[PDB]
Swiss-Prot record:
Changing F58D: Does not affect ability to influence alternative splice site selection. Changing L37T: Reduced binding to N6-methyladenosine (m6A)-containing RNAs. It is found in: Nucleus; Nucleus speckle. It comes from Homo sapiens (Human). Changing L44E: Does not affect ability to influence alternative splice site selection. This is YTH domain-containing protein 1. RNA binds at K18, S19, N20, W34, S35, W85, D131. The chain holds residues 345 to 507 of 727 of the full protein. The gene is YTHDC1. Keywords: Isopeptide bond, mRNA processing, mRNA splicing, Nucleus, Phosphoprotein, RNA-binding, Ubl conjugation. GO terms for cellular component: nuclear speck; nucleoplasm; nucleus; plasma membrane.
């Protein structure tokens, strides 16, 4: 069902996250981590303290799809295990590392979100946006609800972190 998912998304904030390569999304899916440039790191840390859930929605550039979505479980932190991101740019330019819990590891093609517009990006289609673009609550909730259910994930433990 979708009830626990709707509960996790209640009053959430949503951010579009863009990667030039699939390998970085695969690393994030395997390790439960994400890292971004300082400008976005500051926005996400502010958001994490402001809302019950902060949701990252991932898209690999030129793939025509979103690759899933995850909830921040921590602010960014430095000094952990190195992550061998594939960068376009040195690794020192990245901020710290956020821990994330995946909510959905399934893909969604952009063709399926063509009816969703993001007020925070001039009401352009939600697929359109820079890395770090915030997605308004209603649009972000509907986008997440369009993804295929991911039956491998149990949201019970996620709910307990809220
Ligand atoms: O594609 C990217 N660009 C930047 S600036 N940082 C990262 S961290 C993982 C992927 C990725």
């Amino acid at each position: 069902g979708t009830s626990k998912l709707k509960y996790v998304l209640q009053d959430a904030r949503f951010f579009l996250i863009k990667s030039n390569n699939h390998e970085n999304v695969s690393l994030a899916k395997a390790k439960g981590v994400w890292s971004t440039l300082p400008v976005n790191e500051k926005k996400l840390n502010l958001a994490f303290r402001s809302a019950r859930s902060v949701i990252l929605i991932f898209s690999v550039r030129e793939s025509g799809k979103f690759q899933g979505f995850a909830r921040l479980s921590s602010e960014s932190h430095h000094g952990g295990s190195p992550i061998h991101w594939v960068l376009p740019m040195s690794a020192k330019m990245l901020g710290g590392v956020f821990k994330i819990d995946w909510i959905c590891r399934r893909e969604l093609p952009f063709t399926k979100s063509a009816h969703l517009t993001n007020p925070w990006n001039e009401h352009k289609p939600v697929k359109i946006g820079r890395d770090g673009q915030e997605i308004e609550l209603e649009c972000g909730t509907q986008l997440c609800l369009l993804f295929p259910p991911d039956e491998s994930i149990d949201l019970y433990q996620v709910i307990h972190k809220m």
